[model samples]
Target chain A: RPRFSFSIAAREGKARTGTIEMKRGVIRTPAFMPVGTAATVKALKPETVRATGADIILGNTYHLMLRPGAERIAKLGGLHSFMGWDRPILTDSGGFQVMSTKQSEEGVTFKSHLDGSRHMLSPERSIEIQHLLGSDIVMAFDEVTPYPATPSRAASSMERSMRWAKRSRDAFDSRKEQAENAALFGIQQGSVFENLRQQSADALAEIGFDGYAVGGLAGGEGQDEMFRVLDFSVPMLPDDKPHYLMGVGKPDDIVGAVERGIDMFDCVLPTRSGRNGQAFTWDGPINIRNARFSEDLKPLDSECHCAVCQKWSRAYIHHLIRAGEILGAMLMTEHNIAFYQQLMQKIRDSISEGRFSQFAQDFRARYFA
Target chain B: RPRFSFSIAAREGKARTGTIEMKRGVIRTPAFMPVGTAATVKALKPETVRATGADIILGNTYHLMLRPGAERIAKLGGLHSFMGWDRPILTDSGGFQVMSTKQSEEGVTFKSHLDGSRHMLSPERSIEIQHLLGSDIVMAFDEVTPYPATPSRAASSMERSMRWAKRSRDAFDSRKEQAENAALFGIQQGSVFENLRQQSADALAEIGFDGYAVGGLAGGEGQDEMFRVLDFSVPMLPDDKPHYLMGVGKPDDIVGAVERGIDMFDCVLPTRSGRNGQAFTWDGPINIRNARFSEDLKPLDSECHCAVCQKWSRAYIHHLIRAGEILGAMLMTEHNIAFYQQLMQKIRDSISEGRFSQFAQDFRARYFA
Candidate 1:
């Protein structure tokens, strides 16, 4: 069976709209995958998350492996059945979580954040874990280049990550006959150095992968600096393959990255910020905890049409938050996820209509103004 | 307008099924109203609560009057619209909450449990607050008969409560023209004294009300004592009006009370215990946190056809509760509420079929066996 296939449907300027067909489901380009850090999304059920118009969801190998454990989930019929989400699920390598681990040429050893349980993860182990979890899109394990690294340090990190990527690719291929429906994606890490990014991208391309991901961005680098890296690095990846932007971002940041040729994205901003009383809207994000919303009878976003916005008022949400009610978090998270999904839809629509550049410009002006 | 009415549709042994006709909706008895403290049914949304077969919901006057303020909810379109529950809402008077307050002949002064802010509540104030809340079935303010009271103390408390019930009746009737769609029900309070209960019931009957409620039970008297009180107390109230049992109870308690002619009941057992990882089932309440359920892949109740039971497993819920996931609380609460509502349906059906005695016997045997 075909593991994965991607085809560009439309492009306007550098922004492109495409679809990635996997055995599980079709993921539309410029798709925003809500982060399911644990086995489940923070406050939503899988069906509720799906109802927000998400084509795919991102899971963290770190949290799941630490708590439920990959082997246990495998015995229970995989993450899809365990979490009740049957759609395509992309799992991140534990690299981001294992960054503080003592790195060795063989692997990195770390303590679980949940229980201080010790564990080790290497390229091979990461691949085996993802396979065990029955992940559709398995991310390559690599060192997440920390922000503000020296040129020498960045070069050394990128080289080690590139080496890990090759091992990951080989490990993924070794299980190809066993897990025929899974796809592996390689990560590009350079920490804002264009030459190192080019070298990393070229190495990943030579090694080959079902997809390429631009990692090491959105790590406290302001939008301008992040965009600068994306501008130089995104085009270096194989043109035929899907390009994923890892750990990105705010609404404007996503639009900016899409304009720089990024195709897929994942982040916890929508879910996390929502739990923290933040809500994203066309007019930009608003703090639901603000006193001004105490009697604001309007919806969270009057412009956007979501079930949460349609049914709940700002005042009601405000009351719930002040009361420290769980429904407040649930409603806010649902609204934010819907907002992000709607934003992705607009981006896809704009690209399909050949007006992505104009769309991004208009969205940035209004959302960030 | 006809404020409220109750009609018995069928009878079997001592148990009878009836319907309450109110302006908002018709509530089938014996009905199980979920407790919506603080304007929400804890973890579940109003729609989810309503969808669990509830025609009416019970809101705490103390919580709402303290947090959002009764006047604020009135301006925001009353409890029904404020909470997004467009069904009949029965509001308990702050009497239960004000019991610990400094009681005077005129009223009781209490400190807000939330913020320790001082507030006073009298019959007039309680009735006014319920009016402002736009309650469908308003409960009269009466001092709760403390459990384990001496017979003389019980008589004194019952007489005071009876006097307060008269005051509450006067206050409620004074606003009859303003709140044309609302009905007030007096609460009977005599601790465990049968004579005091008779006098209290007679006093309430003399004053008259749209309905009557058996309060002060389920306050650590155990099921047998509660049933014994209900056996004598319930018959003393007028036969035509609905008999509401406040803060009651377990499945067995409800069955026993309904058998004693109670028409309406409200409790936080399903929702509160569900959040605490306990789920009521046909076979008895199961603790989801139990180790035996770690890998037991079965529904909360095999016979339960509720959405939670039909869709998820006990093992999945076990994981959720252990991980402190909110969806666990949502699903469990949903299941428990559905369980209670379904039990009510079965009770109603048994009454309609003239087999309620046998039905209760079977339920008790299976549930407790």
Candidate 2:
């Protein structure tokens, strides 16, 4: 059984489409994983998320570890059975949430964001939660060094994370009771420093992880800056292993990352913006709550095949949102997820068909000026 | 056009079930019509209400005549298209609401519940609004005489309503210049007094109308008293015309009323109680907000075929209500409507199959006694 393996099926002008067969599941390259925080995908049910053409969903270890508790979910027969999702779930380490914790309080504290219950989310605990949650791919605990960080601060944090990563790997290898169907992806963190990123990648490669993730991008840096980081970072990582760009964003960002040879991605933008009546469509972003759409009989996107698009008009959706209907959130989130998944499908097909440049130009033309 | 007609194809004990092929639609007997006030079904879309198995819906002429103004809807292709409900709509005569109005120091002022605007709702205006709404069944404007009222009060109110009924009919008939497709229903008002009830019924019968509704029951009278009134009041109305008992009640009250020969009913109970998390089912009323159901994974009702029950779990619904998810209200209300509709269907099937007595007895055995 291979812990991790990747094969590039097609490539066109440096843009590539591929598949990664991890121990837990087969994830198609250029895949878009919808976020499922706290064992649920916010307003959507698992089947509805699946119907949106998603192959995998990102589950938060930090939130689950705090609320329902990963142990409780495991006792209830793992995250998939508990949440009614049978598809692949990739569990993130508490690193990003831990960084967000500091960002929110202006300093570090061990208090849980949920109930203010103090709990340390160190590397070992993060891996323990992900293991208990039974994710197909578990992320190695690594600090997301904030952008605009001192070089020394970023370097020191990266070195500490590498040490913790080895500990997480050791803990997993030593566990007598564990899921046989799981793989680990180590995170390379160094803010935006190229030399630091290369060193971090070299350290992760020496430790022998299944895959590599370029963390700490899309955190207020514009797409140009992210693309620059990816240009240097993605090529330095192991070519045989899956390359994940954590916290990466919108349709254009995904296309840019894919163009730079990144294979996996996750973000909460689509789902979060969607619940607030913001929807992503092939034409552009549509605000269903806008007064202009109050009597529009057209669907959310006439081109989309989602149930909400097929069964309801924009006017009805507008009324529902103004009326404060919860179905409004569900419908919008469904369309957004569908939009992201559809966008991913287009990217993969374009790459496989060796026309990614044309596809990217067309996507940019419709999505933005 | 048929002014009044009746064809009972089946009967068992005191229950009868058949189809009333009214000018608008085929009303399956023992049907529960949702009350759509303000040209809307409370928080629901008309289509959603229709999907809950309502063949016809009752609209309040009082609410519509005031705000968004009936004249506005008339210009916007009538209320059916305005609210996006194409199904049959039965509009009240504004009589019940108008009767509730008392003369103010500012000259016969009634404040609109929606916008608090003062408006005068007379017999002529009442019929105009209903006609403007393009109502399938237009009720005659009649003042409600309180039950257990003085004989003189009941008689005077009945006399006044009979005169107003004649006016409402004339107004409705003349409005045929534009509304050729609507039907007019006369109101029989005499409280619980058999003589006064008969007098009002005979007057309306002589005048002739599409339907006759027994006004003023279920105001404050208990089920027993209400049923007693229905026993005599229903029979006095023309047997050929559709008999509607206004503001008539609970499952048992409806069952009893149908036994005495009533055809149409409307109430806001399902939508209202559903908002309160109280859902009626065969097993009994299940409050989705209860803490006991926090982890219970069962549908609202195992026996009912409503979409809400067929798709969601008790625990999920419980969380929604407790968390104040509007989907909670929408789904619970949907299930309650389905429950009522299913009950109506059962009653109709039992009567048609000549087994209503057994069905009624069994229903009461489990739910009532």
Candidate 3:
């Protein structure tokens, strides 16, 4: 069994810098995990992923279970060996994705997106699959309370998630070796309702978890509502345990969330936006496909020291994206991932230096400018 | 101006092993140049291209002269800087791709495949683009005589190509500094006619070039006929100059061409085949998308030392290709390019070790088995 522990090295108001020490590696906080949806970080090799300074990458239980079944992957040596990513992998419970079909007290009975084959994603089954994948950070199964819900509507869904979290924890414990080796996170679901959000967080802590994820808010809600929910909800979770904000967000969203004391995040924004020809810099995201970049000799970001920025010019990347070359997606993804990591590092730096509030204010102003 | 030199070190039967030393790097014969069509080796990075053991990469003049025009690349710091490759690059004259155009005594006039914009590609302009790209190996502009042509038709095309060859050389010399640094190779263009091939070879040698390329025979011709053409055509060129077989071949064809004294080769087959879900191995090419591969847990080639083979499984690659992941194109291309370079390395080794014939015989048997 791999050893696991989290230790805060510095704190400034709500924001702090810390390290999650595990046998695979140490992930620095506030950490950002690149979404490796199909056992790959999209167009990047695991080697390039490592170069982007990613300590951990997030995978999806539903995506993996659909394409290459969990049993098949375990038979081939788990997600780490299968994807060529030696570092820790954090996988979400299938709860957030089982949206298309019947949701009963037992589980969500859904159809596979790829083949349209019927399947059931119960809490027990989701945990079993994560165990089979030998995940480092195993998320507890829970249904997401969709945004814009009334207080009663949000309370019912949040309470149901509490029941599912118990099943997820029980099943996680059933797999003795994986349970001992992996750290399980319980996801809290309460859309915008302050009392329900606090109630969900209290229930997850009672059940006990290595981390807690603030779910539901970022799914459909804007930044103001998300921040409002985080302000009261984040304080309800155990301070020593990590607080992960699920499926969040643009750079500004991330910075603001971190300032609110969230420790971890995973998003498709950087990689997905990159594939669509958008590049992120400290200034803001720019569309590389625009005509003005055709002869621009400068790198994607003047201050970025990534391999893409160091070696390639915007003119070349512009040409690649315009020409629909795979290298376009590759370079853009590399830059975006690097930008995300750099952002995380700067956040950690600012928190440690006792200037996170000031940093957040400046970052928000420049990012939206 | 950079240094340029080619020296033959050993000979076995007709096959020889040697090195072409330039300022950028040394290319060991028989070298296999991966085609970087459209300024990229498709799904690979310049760093990975180097890792595949390719000392030189081939670029398409027509593609560059179309999207991201040659002048644009030059202003952005030439093709090498634009593509992030520091090694020597070989660029063809725009002759091969001007197929959908008007052919005159001067040059070929055509429309862009991307935008339908009309364009002209002359021998002088082709040489000028190559110079602008800072090409290390500049190919002469010439019509690729269509396969199965009459002696008179082949002869006329061959004669016109010889005239264009003169113009190509003249323009190449016009750029004095680049001419000193770069090596120009005249392409021979008489379909499969024995006498006409000899005449084309004689004409190119008379006009003069640092190297010679056997161009016309490989297009639509079978191995036996291409071999027959090579038997006579290779002997007609200046023995001291390097012989490049343009756009020539599969692994077996490369082995056969090397046996006929050819030193350099370029083709899109390996990378293109890989992107299409086929993987080349020492034994043969495998369709990784097949059902049998979905559970087959082995490396793409157990014997291959490439990064893809080292870190990934056939099962994973099978999943990637089936899912149409860009990393699929990336991993497949990495493996194929490495495989081609390994083949070339082994060819050079066999030639130098005094058993190229026996090695070729065994390789053909296993590769096609």
Q: List the lowest-lDDT window of 10 residues for candidate 3 chain A.
A: A94-103
| TM-scores, each model vs. reference | 0.98, 0.83, 0.98
Local accuracy of candidate 1 as per-residue lDDT tens digits, B1-369: 246878899987667798988888889999999998888888888888888899999999988899889998888888888779888999999877765368887888888878889998888898889999998888888887567788887888788888888888888778865347788899999998888889889999999989999988888889888888888899899999999998898999899899999999999899999999999999999999998987777889999988888777887888889899888888999999999999999999999998888998999899989
Shift in Å, residue B188, candidate 1: 0.6
Worst 10 residues of 2 chain A by lDDT: A101-110
How far residue A113's Cα lies from its native spot in candidate 1, in Å, is 2.8
Candidate 3 C-alpha lDDT tens digits along A1-369? 246798999998888789998879999999999999989999999989999999999999999998888999999889998889998999999777874188888988877878999988889998988988988999988888666888888889999999999998889888889777899899888888888888888889999999989988677778888898899989998999899998998889888888788999999999999999999988888999999999988999988879999888888999999999999999999999999999998899988889888888898888878
Model 2 lDDT per residue over B38-146, tens place: 6667556566788878999988887666654687667656777766677778888776676554542222357776567778766787877787888887888787876
Task: Report residue A207 deviation for candidate 3 (angstroms).
Answer: 1.4
lDDT per residue as tens, model 2, A213-262: 99888877788888998899888888877789898888888998888988
Q: Report iRMS (Å) of candidate 1.
A: 1.1
Candidate order by DockQ, decreasing, is: 3, 1, 2
Candidate 2, residue B238: how far the Cα is off, in Å: 3.2
Q: How far in Å is the alpha carbon of A42 misplaced in model 1?
A: 1.8
Query: Where is model 3 more than 4 Å wrong at Cα?
Result: B1-3
C-alpha DockQ of every model: 0.68, 0.20, 0.86
Better of 1 and 2 by DockQ: 1
Candidate 1 clash pair list: none
